[PDB]
Amino acid sequence: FGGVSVITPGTNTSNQVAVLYQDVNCWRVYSTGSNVFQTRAGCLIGAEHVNNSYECDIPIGAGICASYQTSQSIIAYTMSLGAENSVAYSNNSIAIPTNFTISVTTEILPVSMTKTSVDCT
Amino acid sequence: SLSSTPSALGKLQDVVNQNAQALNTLVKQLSSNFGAISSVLNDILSRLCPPEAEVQIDRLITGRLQSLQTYVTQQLIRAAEIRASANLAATKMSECVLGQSKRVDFCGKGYHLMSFPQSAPHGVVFLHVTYVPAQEKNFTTAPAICHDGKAHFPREGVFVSNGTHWFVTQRNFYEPQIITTDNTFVSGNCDVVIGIVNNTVYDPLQPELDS
Amino acid sequence: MYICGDSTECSNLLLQYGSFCTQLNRALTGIAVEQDKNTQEVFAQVKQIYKTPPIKDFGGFNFSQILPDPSKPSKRSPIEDLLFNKVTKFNGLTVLPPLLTDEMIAQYTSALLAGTITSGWTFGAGPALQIPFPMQMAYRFNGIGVTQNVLYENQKLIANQFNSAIGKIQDSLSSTPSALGKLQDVVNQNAQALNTLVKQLSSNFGAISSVLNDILSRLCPPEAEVQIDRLITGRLQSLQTYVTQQLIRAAEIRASANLAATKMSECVLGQSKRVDFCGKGYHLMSFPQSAPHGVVFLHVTYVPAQEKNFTTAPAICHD
Ligand SMILES: *[C@@H]1O[C@H](CO)[C@@H](O[C@@H]2O[C@H](CO)[C@@H](O)[C@H](O)[C@H]2NC(C)=O)[C@H](O)[C@H]1NC(C)=O
Ligand SMILES: *[C@@H]1O[C@H](CO)[C@@H](O[C@@H]2O[C@H](CO)[C@@H](O)[C@H](O)[C@H]2NC(C)=O)[C@H](O)[C@H]1NC(C)=O
Ligand SMILES: *[C@@H]1O[C@H](CO)[C@@H](O[C@@H]2O[C@H](CO)[C@@H](O)[C@H](O)[C@H]2NC(C)=O)[C@H](O)[C@H]1NC(C)=O
Ligand SMILES: *[C@@H]1O[C@H](CO)[C@@H](O[C@@H]2O[C@H](CO)[C@@H](O)[C@H](O)[C@H]2NC(C)=O)[C@H](O)[C@H]1NC(C)=O
Ligand SMILES: *[C@@H]1O[C@H](CO)[C@@H](O[C@@H]2O[C@H](CO)[C@@H](O)[C@H](O)[C@H]2NC(C)=O)[C@H](O)[C@H]1NC(C)=O
Ligand SMILES: *[C@@H]1O[C@H](CO)[C@@H](O)[C@H](O)[C@H]1NC(C)=O
Ligand SMILES: *[C@@H]1O[C@H](CO)[C@@H](O)[C@H](O)[C@H]1NC(C)=O
Ligand SMILES: *[C@@H]1O[C@H](CO)[C@@H](O)[C@H](O)[C@H]1NC(C)=O
Ligand SMILES: *[C@@H]1O[C@H](CO)[C@@H](O)[C@H](O)[C@H]1NC(C)=O
């Protein structure tokens, strides 16, 4: 047994969905649509697994995310943690900026919520 | 960004949505029977005969009391989350707006210069202005310069070198200076520092003493 | 599954209550989401995965017990391997996996160390800029009010004191099992909350039997309804108690996670002047290590040692 969840690209884009069974040895599922993939997070049906990692969009669990990509269909992939960067470390070498930019960013915090009162009678 | 990306204000929209749902739930739980013959107190009062009405009324009371206790407990927990956010927002205004902060990534990514608050429904928006180093170059370095057997260290800077010459720059910006006795200070001899290199440290006054 | 165990009669009686399944499940879902958010905020503070050079030429400083061990099946440092080895459904209870597996946490931690070691704090504020490790230390020394002369003249001593301190940490974590008690306690409290939920399930709560199947098998339908309802009330109270406790506990974890995230930004991706925030003594630098359900920070501080008594004066009078 387990819960069932639906992986949905927004409906303002497409109506294809993939369905995840949380704890099934993916066998033990009566659904169709092919594209049956077994993961640590459950039985995923309808998403195409690919070997191309990418930035996470809709998370599934256990390192797996899904997205709607090329026409287009839902795919499953291992999430990337970012681009690699090998720093040219050396005992006699330093990098120094010769220019700069000014960046302004935005941070948002809640301060308050609606104040209510309830008459119990 | 704020105009084209509606998710930008999702934090404030979420506070509104959660409280709206807590109230809508309270309202809808009200219409459940909770084991009573009817959820409408007036139906019980209008047709059921008084001693039986007492029993059915009491079933509704228990159900409604549980609904209210659940609502209040949830509002107390949610209120605590809002208070924590408000305390953080107040801290940030004192430290990011009424000063300059050295706390890393506290007042935005990059080196903080200043911030400007803006009002928003049920919250505050901070515009954080930061300095970000841009295009860099690869320079050769050394911990010290060996002049006449004495070891010279920068007072405020880093020794760097291009393919043929040694200069001293400020750490965060490539603005090379001639290495002089005004830019460096002396401590110890040339044998103790590992990786010390030979250069000429210029005495800015000697030429006047010589002339 | 928790309350009725697929009993049809019980489910139909649950429909006479308010929308309690929706609220219990949504509250637990909200917690589950928050738990990935906490992990993401604490560890994913670096946008690129920085890698180290072959580990050589760091001024004599030895980082081998904090950096990943290439010989293992899981690329964790010797300290992380120690931390991981030391910390220890019938009713509808499902355990969900994290989004970031231990392997991904290890990669984020490794990236942060690579950044800290080869570019100081610049990988934080802007692009990573390479710097010789000893110069990085020189700047960290100026940052505590000690000049650069001290580091270079004593570079060999400093590297040796540093290297010995790291070895001491491994011995401490290995020999003192209480060292990781905070993480073990989080595990133990949640395990107990679930075990309690499971055991409350078998109480009668005023019913003739706690086994719904006994009621259904021998008791005649109108009487079964009464006994089933007694069990439903008891089980609902058990679930509401469980969820409320998880919400409170979740809040405590969130506060800890917010602090851990703050500390990484301020202790690891910079140098901090906040007293006793990044350890006792004058802070020079810190190195994170992964642990089950948490983060371990190794904080490197400068501590003044043997002092002497000198006479002083506020000023000197010359002419
Ligand atoms: C430039 O570096 C060289 C070392 O590479 C220094 O040479 C030494 O100088 C001392 C003092 O006169 C002698 O006793 C050593 O025998 C020299 N070493 C060698 C290998 O010959 C030289 O003095 C440095 N120049 C300056 C201005 O400091
Ligand atoms: C390192 O910087 C120095 C200083 O700018 C460069 O030397 C000067 O080059 C200009 C021509 O561009 C000449 O007119 C000056 O007389 C030079 N100054 C000195 C003191 O020689 C030097 O070429 C740069 N080195 C490299 C490899 O780029
Ligand atoms: C960092 O310190 C460790 C010890 O804590 C060094 O480990 C030694 O490595 C060699 C070569 O693999 C082994 O033969 C020794 O037996 C190891 N020592 C111990 C006590 O087990 C490591 O080489 C040092 N690394 C650097 C760069 O200095
Ligand atoms: C400052 O303290 C350090 C120890 O923290 C002293 O270094 C030790 O000196 C003894 C005696 O020569 C050696 O056996 C140890 O191996 C040294 N320790 C290390 C880590 O190298 C140092 O001599 C003291 N120094 C002063 C006042 O200069
Ligand atoms: C050393 O300290 C003494 C005070 O203890 C200074 O003496 C005074 O100097 C002024 C200026 O010449 C005289 O008007 C006072 O009468 C002196 N005091 C006494 C008690 O005689 C002396 O000038 C100081 N030395 C220096 C270099 O500043
Ligand atoms: C599914 O069952 C087979 C045995 O029939 C087993 O070999 C396999 O590892 C199981 N897969 C999962 C995900 O449990
Ligand atoms: C520094 O040198 C390395 C050599 O591998 C090169 O990849 C890097 O782009 C250079 N950096 C700059 C700022 O020129
Ligand atoms: C850097 O390493 C090279 C090769 O071992 C050595 O010759 C040089 O002196 C070192 N420089 C410094 C500053 O340690
Ligand atoms: C300073 O003098 C006092 C005199 O009572 C003595 O107790 C103390 O140990 C001395 N401190 C040092 C560092 O020598």
UniProtKB/Swiss-Prot annotation, chain A:
Query: Fragment boundaries within the full protein?
Result: 592 to 739 of 1273
Give each disulfide bond as a residue pair.
26-43, 56-65
Protein name (Swiss-Prot/TrEMBL): Spike glycoprotein
Family, according to the entry, reads as follows: Belongs to the betacoronaviruses spike protein family.
The listed outcome for residue 98 to I is: In strain: Alpha/B.1.1.7
The free-text domain remark for this protein reads: Contains sequence and structural motifs very similar to those of a bacterial superantigen and can directly bind and activate T-cell receptors. Activation of a broad T-cell repertoire may be involved in the hyperinflammatory syndrome in acute COVID disease. The KxHxx motif seems to function as an ER retrieval and binds COPI in vitro.
Another remark in the UniProt entry says: Variant D614G has become the most prevalent circulating sequence in the global pandemic since April 2020. The mutation is associated with higher viral loads produced in cell culture and animal models. It would not change pathogenicity nor neutralization properties vs vaccination. May be prevalent because the mutation increases virus transmission in human population.
PTM section of the record = The cytoplasmic Cys-rich domain is palmitoylated. Palmitoylated spike proteins drive the formation of localized ordered cholesterol and sphingo-lipid-rich lipid nanodomains in the early Golgi, where viral budding occurs.
What organism is the protein native to? Severe acute respiratory syndrome coronavirus 2 (2019-nCoV)
Outcome (variant: residue 22 to H): In strain: A23.1
- Specify the effect of residue 67 to A: No effect on O-glycosylation by host GALNT1
Cell compartment(s), UniProt: Virion membrane; Host endoplasmic reticulum-Golgi intermediate compartment membrane; Host cell membrane
Q: Any recorded use in biotech or industry, and what is it?
A: Main component of the anti-COVID vaccine Chadox1/AZD1222/AstraZeneca; in which the human tPA leader sequence is added in N-terminus to enhance protein secretion.
List the glycosylation sites: 12, 25, 51, 70, 91, 99
Curated annotation (Swiss-Prot), chain B:
Result when mutating residue 182 to H: In strain: Alpha/B.1.1.7
What range of the parent protein does this fragment cover? Answer: 937 to 1147 of 1273
Job description of the protein: Subunit of the fusion protein that is processed upon entry into the host cell. Mediates fusion of the virion and cellular membranes by functioning as a class I viral fusion protein. Contains a viral fusion peptide that is unmasked after S2 cleavage. This cleavage can occur at the cell membrane by host TMPRSS2 or during endocytosis by host CSTL. In either case, this triggers an extensive and irreversible conformational change that leads to fusion of the viral envelope with the cellular cytoplasmic membrane, releasing viral genomic RNA into the host cell cytoplasm.
Q: Report the outcome of residue 165 to Y.
A: In strain: Theta/P.3
Q: Residue ranges of region Heptad repeat 1?
A: 1-34
Q: Which residues are glycosylated?
A: 138, 162, 198
Annotated S-S bridges:
96-107, 146-190
Annotated source species: Severe acute respiratory syndrome coronavirus 2
Instruction: Give the gene name.
Output: S
Q: Which domain of life is it from?
A: Viruses
Full protein name: Spike protein S2'
Can you tell me which residues the record assigns to a coiled coil? 13-57
The outcome of changing residue 33 to K is:
In strain: Omicron/BA.1, Omicron/BA.2, Omicron/BA.2.12.1, Omicron/BA.2.75, Omicron/BA.4, Omicron/BA.5, Omicron/BQ.1.1, Omicron/XBB.1.5, Omicron/EG.5.1
From Swiss-Prot, chain C:
So what does mutating residue 91 to K actually do? In strain: Omicron/BA.1
Please list the disulfide bridges.
4-10, 267-278
The listed outcome for residue 204 to K is:
In strain: Omicron/BA.1, Omicron/BA.2, Omicron/BA.2.12.1, Omicron/BA.2.75, Omicron/BA.4, Omicron/BA.5, Omicron/BQ.1.1, Omicron/XBB.1.5, Omicron/EG.5.1
The segment annotated Heptad repeat 1 runs over 155-205
Result, substituting residue 94 to N: In strain: Lambda/C.37
| Glycan-carrying positions | 62, 309
The annotated site for Cleavage falls at 76-77
Q: Outcome of altering residue 123 to L? A: In strain: Eta/B.1.525
Q: Look up the coiled coil feature and give its residue ranges.
A: 184-228
Function in brief: Precursor of the fusion protein processed in the biosynthesis of the S protein and the formation of virus particle. Mediates fusion of the virion and cellular membranes by functioning as a class I viral fusion protein. Contains two viral fusion peptides that are unmasked after cleavage. The S2/S2' cleavage occurs during virus entry at the cell membrane by host TMPRSS2 or during endocytosis by host CSTL.
Protein name as it appears in the record = Spike protein S2
Which species does the entry assign this protein to?
Severe acute respiratory syndrome coronavirus 2 (2019-nCoV)
Gene expressing this chain: S
Say which residues of the entire protein are included here: 740 to 1084 of 1273
